[PDB]
């Protein structure tokens, strides 16, 4: 499982964004419809791929047939079968957050997951609320503004 994380990270400009994969890092910035989820080549993914049902779920690397691979997303055969849940999010190789469907259950609330601060640094000053989601009633922690 842990060997199934696409880890093709590349800091073309040494801006320090890659530190957020191991730990939160002092960060500040002034500058701070999605397409359907298809098959994402693992070569262009850096870090875990999260999908929301609306609960966050880690999607590891698999081949195009769905068999789990354990090559850290370095082989060309490794992809992410994301066509199913409501949306997925991940980091590309050059530090851009990719979405498809994302974790926005409300125009101002978002599902909270371990790598939210990394994928969406804009939401660092958000408050975590235990909100209720109607899908059956599901309750989950959400970072809201």
């Amino acid at each position, epitope marked *: 499982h*842990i*060997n199934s*994380t*696409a*880890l*093709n*990270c*590349n*800091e073309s400009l*040494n801006t*320090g964004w*890659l*530190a957020g*994969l*191991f*730990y939160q*890092h002092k960060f500040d910035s002034s500058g701070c419809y999605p397409r359907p989820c298809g098959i994402v080549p693992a070569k262009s993914v*850096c870090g875990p791929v999260y999908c929301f049902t609306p609960s966050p779920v880690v999607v590891g690397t698999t081949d195009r047939s769905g068999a789990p691979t354990y*090559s*850290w*997303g*370095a082989n060309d055969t490794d992809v992410f079968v994301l066509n199913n849940w409501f949306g997925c999010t991940w980091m590309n190789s050059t530090g851009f957050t990719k979405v498809c469907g994302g974790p926005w259950i409300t125009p101002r609330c978002m599902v909270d997951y371990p790598y939210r601060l990394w994928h969406y640094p804009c939401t660092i000053n958000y408050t975590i609320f235990k909100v209720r989601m109607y899908v059956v009633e599901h309750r989950l922690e959400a970072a809201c503004n």
Partner: antibody
Amino acid sequence: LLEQSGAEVKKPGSSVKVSCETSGGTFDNYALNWVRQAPGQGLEWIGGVVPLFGTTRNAQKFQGRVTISDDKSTGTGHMELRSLRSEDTAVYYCVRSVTPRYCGGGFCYGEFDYWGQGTLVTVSS
Amino acid sequence: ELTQSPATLSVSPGERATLSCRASQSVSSNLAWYQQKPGQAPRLLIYGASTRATGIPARFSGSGSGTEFTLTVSRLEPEDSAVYFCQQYYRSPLTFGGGTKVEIKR
């Protein structure tokens, strides 16, 4: 500040293990590598380990006879070099990197932020 | 594989010392500069070819990309007598330069 063990003297073919402790509390670093410098040569990278993923990388001169570990609870790194030869007489340094700059499955590289004072390992008969 | 020329240097205080680091192959901006005072642990000066590390005074300045790199220590002071070496982190294995021992005149 990184503090390393005292100097060592070993017979050829033996094994040496060098520790690397942190002066203060454990801090944020993603990888632990080891570097040595022979008396007439420049600095040489030996290997490294990224504890979060459990992956390791070695140089070809050390494949099969080197083992690098990093205890995150205590903040103490380790390097055991086996099958020692006289070419291994060098000052061995301990490094810890804080900001990764490139990751290839499943290892991550970058500049070395903190260095240890060094440990002389002499291999002689 | 990195190459540093010259191997030694001798510059007067308050002047400018220029060091070089040639790369046999392009390493982009994945290069770091270090300072090793005699009998001390090496100290990171520059990373990313041209970015100073935290706590590094502004008189240290690095530049270059691809295969050519240059470290510049302006307003040289006696505490700058040390060995400086470059390191690339663009490809495995990680390689260091031969070093450049600097003597401060007086």
